Amino acid sequence: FPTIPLSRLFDNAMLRAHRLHQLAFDTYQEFEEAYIPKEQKYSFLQNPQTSLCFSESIPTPSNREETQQKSNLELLRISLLLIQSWLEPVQFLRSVFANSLVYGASDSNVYDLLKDLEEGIQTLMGRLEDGSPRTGQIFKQTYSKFDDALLKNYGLLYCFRKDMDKVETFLRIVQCRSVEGSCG
């Protein structure tokens, strides 16, 4: 029967990663310029109550240099654990997404994309057997958990925007190495 080639496998996963990130970005940015002043945007980042994200329990590369020194199975694993970590917490953005003029932002729609992109990365871990010793950190499946309300919702939304940017970057790094002629 037909094999779906890695080319299309990667290509559809990036449609999803990219829609998830575009949704997190646009929805965050319209919430920000309606309810957060810079006064508060800074107070938030400044103070750890409103800065750390529950997803931070997963070790992720922070810059390019570290990102490129990770293997394909490691970047796909970090990517999978970041998506698995948003499967339940997107429930708490229901109240923020329902008042969003962004077409597509809805807990039911975003959960659907997270669940489909999750199947894809698993499909990619089954094809991409690319050397990696499967061990310990990152191969401990800590999908990150999650324990006023305006800043509560801005924190969830700040971390969604970021973790979606991480998933989008991390899948592109392994598509660029796996599928030649993808990036150039």
Partner: protein, 194 residues
């Protein structure tokens, strides 16, 4: 005679299969997402007379599917595919055109034809990325002149003879996968003697 015809996915999210058995016993559809155990057709009715509709929940774009049409135990036809392989999107909605201008000679003119995406791509976006293939011919010519597949919903048509009646039809496809869908409603472009 009890064979498969077409499985088609109109957006890259659902699909269905059709066959021929309109007297020519009980035909049944059986499927397996390849990874032996057959599940059976989820909804033999939403697409009508000889169909099987696999919805959102039943359609995954990461695995190959197989299907065997079982006419009273016996397998008649059977076929495997994957969903991007059967994407065949709806034709474009609302074509029109605009007259740019006519030459000094008055023999030829320049139009521009716009169209509009099928409703089920709007809905999607960042999943379903369409490309359009416009073709045109004279109302009494024979072979259609085709134009290069463009991603925009507007392309100009140049060099048309101001008093020759024309037919413009455009069809669509997903950006590199599947194959073309059917054609739009055909526009009849008629240029006025200016």
């Amino acid at each position: 005679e009890p064979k498969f015809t077409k499985c088609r996915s109109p957006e890259r999210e659902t699909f269905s299969c059709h066959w021929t058995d309109e007297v020519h016993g009980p035909i049944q559809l059986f499927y397996t997402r390849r990874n032996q155990e057959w599940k059976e057709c989820p909804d033999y009715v939403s697409a009508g007379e000889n169909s099987c509709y696999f919805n959102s929940s039943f359609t995954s774009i990461w695995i190959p599917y197989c299907i065997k049409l079982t006419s009273n135990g016996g397998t008649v036809d059977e076929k495997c595919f994957s969903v991007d392989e059967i994407v065949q999107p709806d034709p474009p909605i609302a074509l029109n055109w605009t007259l740019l201008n006519v030459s000094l000679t008055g023999i030829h003119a320049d139009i521009q034809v716009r169209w509009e995406a099928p409703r089920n791509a709007d809905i999607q976006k960042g999943w379903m990325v369409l490309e359009y293939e416009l073709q045109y011919k004279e109302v009494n010519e024979t072979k259609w002149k085709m134009m290069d597949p463009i991603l925009t919903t507007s392309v100009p048509v140049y060099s048309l003879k101001v008093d020759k009646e024309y037919e413009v039809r455009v069809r669509s496809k997903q950006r590199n996968s599947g194959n073309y869908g059917e054609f739009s409603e055909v526009l009849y472009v008629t240029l006025p003697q200016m």
